[PDB]
XYZ file of C-alpha atoms in Angstrom:
206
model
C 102.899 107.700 145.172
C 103.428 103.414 145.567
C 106.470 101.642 145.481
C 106.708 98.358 143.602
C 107.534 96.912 146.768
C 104.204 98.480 148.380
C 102.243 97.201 145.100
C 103.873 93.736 145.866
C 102.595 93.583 148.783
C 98.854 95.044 148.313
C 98.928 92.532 146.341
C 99.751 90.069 148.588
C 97.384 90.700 151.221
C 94.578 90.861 148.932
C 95.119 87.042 147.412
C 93.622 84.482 149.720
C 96.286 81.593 150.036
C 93.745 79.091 151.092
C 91.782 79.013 147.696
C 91.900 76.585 145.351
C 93.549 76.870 141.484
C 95.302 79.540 140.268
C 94.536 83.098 141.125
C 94.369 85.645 138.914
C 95.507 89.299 138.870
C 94.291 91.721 136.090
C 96.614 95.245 135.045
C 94.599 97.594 133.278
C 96.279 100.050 131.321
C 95.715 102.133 127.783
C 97.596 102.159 124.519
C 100.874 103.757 125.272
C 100.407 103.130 129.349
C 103.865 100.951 129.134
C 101.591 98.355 131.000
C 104.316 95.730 130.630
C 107.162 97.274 131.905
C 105.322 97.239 135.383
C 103.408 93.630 134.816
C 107.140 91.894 134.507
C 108.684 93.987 137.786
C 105.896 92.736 139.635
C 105.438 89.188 138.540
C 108.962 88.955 139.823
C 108.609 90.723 143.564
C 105.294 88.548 144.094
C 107.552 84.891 142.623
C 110.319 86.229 145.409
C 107.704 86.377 147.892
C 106.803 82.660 147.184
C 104.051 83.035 144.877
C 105.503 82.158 141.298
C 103.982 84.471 138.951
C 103.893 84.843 135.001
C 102.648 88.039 133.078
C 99.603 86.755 130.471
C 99.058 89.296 127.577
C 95.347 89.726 126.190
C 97.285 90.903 122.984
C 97.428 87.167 121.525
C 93.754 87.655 121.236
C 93.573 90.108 118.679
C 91.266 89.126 115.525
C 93.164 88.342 112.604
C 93.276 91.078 109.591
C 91.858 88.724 107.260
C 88.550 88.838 109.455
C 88.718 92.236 110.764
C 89.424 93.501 106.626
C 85.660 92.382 105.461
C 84.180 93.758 108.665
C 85.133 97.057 108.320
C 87.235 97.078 111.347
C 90.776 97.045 110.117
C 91.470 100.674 110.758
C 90.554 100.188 114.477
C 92.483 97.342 115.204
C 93.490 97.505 118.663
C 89.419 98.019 119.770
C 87.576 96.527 122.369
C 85.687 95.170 118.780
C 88.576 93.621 117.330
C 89.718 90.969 120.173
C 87.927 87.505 120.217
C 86.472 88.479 124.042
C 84.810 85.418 123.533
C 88.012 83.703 123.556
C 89.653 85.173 126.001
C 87.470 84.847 128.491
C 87.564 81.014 127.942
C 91.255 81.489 128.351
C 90.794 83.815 131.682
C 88.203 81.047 133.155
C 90.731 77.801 131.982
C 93.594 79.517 133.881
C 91.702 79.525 137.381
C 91.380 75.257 137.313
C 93.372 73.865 134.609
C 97.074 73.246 135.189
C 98.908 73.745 132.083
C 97.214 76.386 129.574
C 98.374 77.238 126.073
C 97.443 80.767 124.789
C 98.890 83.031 121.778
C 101.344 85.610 121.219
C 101.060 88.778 119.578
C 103.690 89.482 117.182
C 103.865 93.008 116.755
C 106.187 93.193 113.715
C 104.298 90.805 111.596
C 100.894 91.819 112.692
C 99.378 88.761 113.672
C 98.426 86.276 116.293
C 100.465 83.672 116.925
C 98.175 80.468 118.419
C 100.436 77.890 120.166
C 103.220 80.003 121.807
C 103.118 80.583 124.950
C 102.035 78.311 128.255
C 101.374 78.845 131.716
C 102.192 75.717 134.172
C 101.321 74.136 137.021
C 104.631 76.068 138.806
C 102.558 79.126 138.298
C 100.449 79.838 141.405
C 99.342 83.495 139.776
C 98.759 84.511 136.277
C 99.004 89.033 135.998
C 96.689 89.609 133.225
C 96.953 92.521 131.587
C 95.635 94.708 128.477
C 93.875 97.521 127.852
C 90.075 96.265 128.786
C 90.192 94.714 131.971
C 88.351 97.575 133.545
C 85.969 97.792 130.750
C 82.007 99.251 131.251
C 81.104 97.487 128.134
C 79.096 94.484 127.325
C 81.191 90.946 127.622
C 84.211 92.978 129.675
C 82.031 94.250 132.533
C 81.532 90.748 133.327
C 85.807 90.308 133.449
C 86.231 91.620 136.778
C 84.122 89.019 138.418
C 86.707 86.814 137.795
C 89.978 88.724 138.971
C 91.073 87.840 142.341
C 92.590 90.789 142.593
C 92.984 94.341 140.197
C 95.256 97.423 139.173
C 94.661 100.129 137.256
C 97.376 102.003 135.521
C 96.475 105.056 135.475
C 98.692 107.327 132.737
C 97.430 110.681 132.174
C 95.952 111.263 128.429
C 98.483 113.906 127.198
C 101.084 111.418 128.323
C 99.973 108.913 126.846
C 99.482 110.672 123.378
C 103.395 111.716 123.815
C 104.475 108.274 124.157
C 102.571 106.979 121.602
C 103.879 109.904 118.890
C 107.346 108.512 119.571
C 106.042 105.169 119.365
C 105.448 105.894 115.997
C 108.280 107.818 115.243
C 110.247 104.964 115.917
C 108.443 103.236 113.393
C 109.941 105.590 110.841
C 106.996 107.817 110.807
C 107.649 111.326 109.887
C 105.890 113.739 113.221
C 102.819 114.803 111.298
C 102.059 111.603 110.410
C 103.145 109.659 113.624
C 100.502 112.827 115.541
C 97.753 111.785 113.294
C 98.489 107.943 113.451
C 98.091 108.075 117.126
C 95.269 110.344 117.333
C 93.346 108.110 115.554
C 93.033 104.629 117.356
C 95.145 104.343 119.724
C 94.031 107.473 121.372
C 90.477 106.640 120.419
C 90.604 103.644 122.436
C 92.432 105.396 125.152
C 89.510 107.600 125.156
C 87.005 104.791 125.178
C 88.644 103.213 128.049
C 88.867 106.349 129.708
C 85.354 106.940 129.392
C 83.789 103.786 130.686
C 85.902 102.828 134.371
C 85.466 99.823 136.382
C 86.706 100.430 140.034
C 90.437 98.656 140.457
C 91.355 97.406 143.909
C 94.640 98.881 143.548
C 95.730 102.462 141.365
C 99.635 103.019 140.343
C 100.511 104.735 140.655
């Protein structure tokens, strides 16, 4: 029931253009929300609207599988448990007053982190944040939205988000049974997590 061009622009009149450093704007989504094929849309409108904007994944902060494995936690990669919060909240606090920032990339096909590959500049006057626990009523990510100048929540309805993440996995050359039971564990675990512990977003899309 919002228009990009209406999220653009609640956007807009919710950033204050006389503060100092780089503002920040946080999209909160779930596994399988297709967060980033609304981050990108809208990091464009705002840049045409004279506020150059770059989408920042939290992805690049997952753990690495060689220190998840003798924790116990490699089956729930993808949990609140498994990022280095730690780390990306230095990263989320850096971006506000430092002018050129270097974070990692999550490579999706080769599992893994990727430190080093991506940079946002001194062009960039506002970094969209998103991931999946932006919103987060948990210990360490509560204390996230004190920092966001401004924040969405996608909000994707639970049966479509299991749906999308089934073909997810079928694409991934998983037979149904086993792309169902793939995605009912974690993914929609975390889905359920994040479901069941809201922050209140300044903005809802849709």
């Amino acid at each position: 029931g919002m228009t990009l061009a209406a999220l653009c622009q609640g956007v807009l009149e919710r950033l204050d253009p006389r503060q100092p450093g780089r503002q920040l704007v946080a999209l909160s989504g779930a596994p399988g929300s297709g967060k980033s094929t609304l981050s990108n849309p809208l990091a464009a409108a705002l840049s045409a609207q004279g506020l150059p904007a770059e989408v920042v994944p939290m992805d690049g902060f997952h753990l690495d599988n060689r220190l998840l494995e003798p924790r116990g936690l490699l089956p729930r990669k993808g949990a609140p448990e498994t990022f280095d919060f730690e780390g990306f909240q230095r990263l989320c606090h850096a971006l506000k007053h430092q002018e050129r920032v270097i974070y990692p990339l999550f490579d999706r096909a080769r599992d893994i982190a990727i430190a080093g590959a991506a940079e946002v500049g001194p062009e960039c006057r506002v970094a969209i944040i998103e991931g999946n626990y932006l919103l987060f009523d948990a210990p360490g990510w509560r204390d996230l939205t004190a920092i966001w100048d401004v924040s969405i929540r996608l909000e994707v309805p639970m049966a479509d988000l299991e749906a999308r993440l089934v073909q997810r996995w079928l694409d991934h050359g998983l037979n149904h049974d086993a792309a169902v039971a793939r995605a009912q564990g974690n993914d929609l675990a975390n889905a359920r997590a994040i479901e069941a512990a809201r922050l209140p977003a300044d903005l809802t899309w849709p």
